[PDB]
Write an enzyme that holds these catalytic residues in place. Structure first.
Site, PDB file in Angstrom:
ATOM      1  N   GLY A  11       0.892  -1.241   0.024  1.00 38.96           N
ATOM      2  CA  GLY A  11       0.038   0.105  -0.071  1.00 38.96           C
ATOM      3  C   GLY A  11       0.875   1.283  -0.015  1.00 38.96           C
ATOM      4  O   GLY A  11       2.071   1.189   0.327  1.00 38.96           O
ATOM      5  N   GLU A  12       0.256   2.317  -0.413  1.00 40.54           N
ATOM      6  CA  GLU A  12       0.853   3.742  -0.376  1.00 40.54           C
ATOM      7  C   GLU A  12      -0.319   4.533  -0.199  1.00 40.54           C
ATOM      8  O   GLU A  12      -1.507   4.489  -0.961  1.00 40.54           O
ATOM      9  CB  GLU A  12       1.553   4.016  -1.724  1.00 40.54           C
ATOM     10  CG  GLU A  12       2.852   4.260  -1.494  1.00 40.54           C
ATOM     11  N   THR A  14      -1.198   8.895   1.395  1.00 35.96           N
ATOM     12  CA  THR A  14      -0.438  10.366   1.534  1.00 35.96           C
ATOM     13  C   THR A  14       0.782  10.526   2.687  1.00 35.96           C
ATOM     14  O   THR A  14       1.679  11.064   2.395  1.00 35.96           O
ATOM     15  CB  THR A  14      -1.662  11.567   1.774  1.00 35.96           C
ATOM     16  OG1 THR A  14      -2.610  11.133   2.965  1.00 35.96           O
ATOM     17  CG2 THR A  14      -2.530  12.044   0.428  1.00 35.96           C
ATOM     18  N   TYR A  15       0.439   9.844   3.621  1.00 30.82           N
ATOM     19  CA  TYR A  15       1.424   9.826   4.854  1.00 30.82           C
ATOM     20  C   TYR A  15       2.486   8.782   4.675  1.00 30.82           C
ATOM     21  O   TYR A  15       3.552   9.191   5.210  1.00 30.82           O
ATOM     22  CB  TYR A  15       0.586   9.683   6.176  1.00 30.82           C
ATOM     23  CG  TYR A  15      -0.435  10.864   6.304  1.00 30.82           C
ATOM     24  CD1 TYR A  15       0.075  12.206   6.683  1.00 30.82           C
ATOM     25  CD2 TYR A  15      -1.755  10.711   6.176  1.00 30.82           C
ATOM     26  CE1 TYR A  15      -0.965  13.137   7.063  1.00 30.82           C
ATOM     27  CE2 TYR A  15      -2.800  11.669   6.227  1.00 30.82           C
ATOM     28  CZ  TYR A  15      -2.274  12.754   6.758  1.00 30.82           C
ATOM     29  OH  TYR A  15      -3.237  13.896   6.921  1.00 30.82           O
ATOM     30  N   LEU A  83      -3.634  -8.508   6.754  1.00 27.13           N
ATOM     31  CA  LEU A  83      -4.886  -9.460   6.032  1.00 27.13           C
ATOM     32  C   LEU A  83      -4.168  -9.315   4.444  1.00 27.13           C
ATOM     33  O   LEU A  83      -3.744  -8.479   3.928  1.00 27.13           O
ATOM     34  CB  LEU A  83      -6.026  -8.829   6.256  1.00 27.13           C
ATOM     35  CG  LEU A  83      -6.768  -9.281   7.710  1.00 27.13           C
ATOM     36  CD1 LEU A  83      -6.254  -8.355   8.693  1.00 27.13           C
ATOM     37  CD2 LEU A  83      -8.166  -9.094   7.434  1.00 27.13           C
ATOM     38  N   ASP A  86      -7.684  -7.011  -0.100  1.00 28.99           N
ATOM     39  CA  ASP A  86      -8.612  -6.004   0.061  1.00 28.99           C
ATOM     40  C   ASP A  86     -10.090  -6.131  -0.568  1.00 28.99           C
ATOM     41  O   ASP A  86      -9.908  -6.630  -1.535  1.00 28.99           O
ATOM     42  CB  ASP A  86      -8.058  -4.499   0.015  1.00 28.99           C
ATOM     43  CG  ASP A  86      -7.515  -4.233  -1.433  1.00 28.99           C
ATOM     44  OD1 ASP A  86      -8.286  -3.925  -2.211  1.00 28.99           O
ATOM     45  OD2 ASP A  86      -6.260  -4.244  -1.731  1.00 28.99           O
ATOM     46  N   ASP A 127     -11.546   8.335   6.029  1.00 29.92           N
ATOM     47  CA  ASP A 127     -11.241   7.888   4.500  1.00 29.92           C
ATOM     48  C   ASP A 127     -11.536   6.556   4.104  1.00 29.92           C
ATOM     49  O   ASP A 127     -10.751   6.055   3.635  1.00 29.92           O
ATOM     50  CB  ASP A 127      -9.657   8.405   4.319  1.00 29.92           C
ATOM     51  CG  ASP A 127      -9.302   8.280   2.837  1.00 29.92           C
ATOM     52  OD1 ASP A 127      -9.859   8.551   1.959  1.00 29.92           O
ATOM     53  OD2 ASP A 127      -8.017   8.094   2.527  1.00 29.92           O
ATOM     54  N   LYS A 129     -12.431   3.623   1.912  1.00 32.17           N
ATOM     55  CA  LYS A 129     -12.594   3.102   0.717  1.00 32.17           C
ATOM     56  C   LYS A 129     -12.283   1.893   0.599  1.00 32.17           C
ATOM     57  O   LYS A 129     -11.740   1.287   1.446  1.00 32.17           O
ATOM     58  CB  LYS A 129     -11.509   3.981  -0.132  1.00 32.17           C
ATOM     59  CG  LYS A 129     -10.205   4.032   0.369  1.00 32.17           C
ATOM     60  CD  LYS A 129      -9.612   5.199  -0.369  1.00 32.17           C
ATOM     61  CE  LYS A 129      -8.161   5.383   0.190  1.00 32.17           C
ATOM     62  NZ  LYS A 129      -7.229   6.408  -0.005  1.00 32.17           N
TER      63      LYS A 129
HETATM   64  O1  MFZ Z   1      -1.754   3.412   3.463  1.00 31.90           O
HETATM   65  C1  MFZ Z   1      -2.374   2.690   2.304  1.00 31.90           C
HETATM   66  C2  MFZ Z   1      -2.430   1.590   3.112  1.00 31.90           C
HETATM   67  C3  MFZ Z   1      -2.619   0.158   3.226  1.00 31.90           C
HETATM   68  C4  MFZ Z   1      -2.596  -1.041   3.781  1.00 31.90           C
HETATM   69  C5  MFZ Z   1      -2.673  -2.186   2.812  1.00 31.90           C
HETATM   70  N1  MFZ Z   1      -2.723  -3.342   3.396  1.00 31.90           N
HETATM   71  C6  MFZ Z   1      -2.610  -2.998   4.784  1.00 31.90           C
HETATM   72  C7  MFZ Z   1      -2.875  -3.849   5.859  1.00 31.90           C
HETATM   73 CL1  MFZ Z   1      -2.622  -5.857   5.381  1.00 31.90          CL
HETATM   74  C8  MFZ Z   1      -2.726  -3.515   7.041  1.00 31.90           C
HETATM   75  C9  MFZ Z   1      -2.575  -2.129   7.567  1.00 31.90           C
HETATM   76  C10 MFZ Z   1      -2.812  -1.395   6.374  1.00 31.90           C
HETATM   77 CL2  MFZ Z   1      -2.677   0.446   6.599  1.00 31.90          CL
HETATM   78  C11 MFZ Z   1      -2.562  -1.591   4.956  1.00 31.90           C
END
Ligand code: MFZ
Ligand code: MFZ
EC number: 2.7.11.22
Length: 278
Positions: A11-12, A14-15, A83, A86, A127, A129
């Site tokens: 994941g990516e 803003t922060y 996990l 998504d 946020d 989504k």
């Molecule tokens: O910041 C964007 C994001 C993200 C995440 C993708 N997969 C995740 C899992 Cl498995 C746990 C926690 C987070 Cl924040 C994310």
């Protein structure tokens, strides 16, 4: 950090960037969120620490656990439970046939439970989504990545309300509910004004009657075009009347009339709710 080995980027935002990683001390696989800290929050960290402590204290089956917080080298690492999938990837994988309606309803129910819990512990997501709703093999779904896509943004945010409420999460979840049902984003705006005008074209341009105080909002313009409201029956077919009624309450313009997570849990739509295996 020396105790974590990166497996892959997952994941990516803003922060920061989020990696699947292995914790060398526990052997556990985690999601590692790396945030570069500005010197301003390092100098005045009290609000950041208060907000992150509220996130850390959250213990609920429908919330991704914050396991550890590491402050080192002008960075903050947030270590989350991991996990594998998504809801965005699951929606995509399910696009030929649709997510079965019992599974839509189970996911909606569980997210409302997570939100009711957040909201009663004065935490807002801000946020929501599909990409930050995480699913497992047991039929669970979990809120993750608590607060650029505008599709799920509540109209009061788009109209410049700075002091918005828990109702913003209900709006985003309503948009996600419609999307699971139809297999199309409800309001796929590509700018803030196009986002606003897509909502107005479907739900009608709000006025003082439906949304008392709307015309006094920071970014409200009298010159907004005035569109009539469409019927929900053309918006989310083939959702039944229970589902349509619930969705309409989640998409009320007035944040003060919009249904709470706790009241939504009691809606007749959840009378036959079950927990299927995806
Ligand atoms: O910041 C964007 C994001 C993200 C995440 C993708 N997969 C995740 C899992 Cl498995 C746990 C926690 C987070 Cl924040 C994310
Ligand atoms: O939860 C323990 C902690 C901590 C922090 C120390 N410095 C911080 C900054 Cl600059 C931002 C956010 C956090 Cl949580 C911390």
């Amino acid at each position: 950090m020396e105790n974590f080995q990166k497996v892959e980027k997952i994941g990516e935002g803003t922060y920061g960037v989020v990696y699947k990683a292995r914790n060398k001390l526990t052997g556990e696989v985690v999601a590692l969120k790396k945030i570069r800290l500005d010197t301003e929050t390092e100098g005045v960290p009290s609000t950041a620490i208060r907000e992150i402590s509220l996130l850390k204290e959250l213990n609920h089956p429908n919330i991704v656990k914050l396991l550890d917080v590491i402050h080192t080298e002008n960075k903050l690492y947030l270590v989350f439970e991991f996990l594998h999938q998504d809801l965005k990837k699951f929606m995509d994988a399910s696009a030929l046939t649709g997510i079965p309606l019992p599974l839509i309803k189970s996911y909606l129910f569980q997210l409302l439970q997570g939100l009711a819990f957040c909201h009663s512990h004065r935490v807002l997501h801000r946020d929501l989504k599909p990409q930050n709703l995480l699913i497992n093999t047991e039929g669970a779904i979990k809120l993750a990545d608590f607060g650029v896509t505008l599709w799920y943004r509540a109209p009061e945010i788009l109209l410049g309300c700075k002091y918005y409420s828990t109702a913003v999460d209900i709006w985003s979840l309503g948009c996600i509910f419609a999307e699971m049902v139809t297999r199309r984003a409800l309001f796929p705006g590509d700018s803030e004004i196009d986002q606003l005008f897509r909502i107005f074209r479907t739900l009608g341009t709000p006025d003082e009657v439906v949304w008392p105080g709307v015309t006094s909002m920071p970014d409200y313009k009298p010159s907004f075009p005035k569109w009539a409201r469409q019927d929900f029956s053309k918006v989310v077919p083939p959702l039944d009347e229970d589902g349509r009624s619930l969705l309409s309450q989640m998409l009320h313009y007035d944040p003060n009339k919009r249904i709470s997570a706790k009241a939504a849990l009691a809606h007749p739509f959840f009378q036959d709710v079950t927990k299927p295996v995806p």
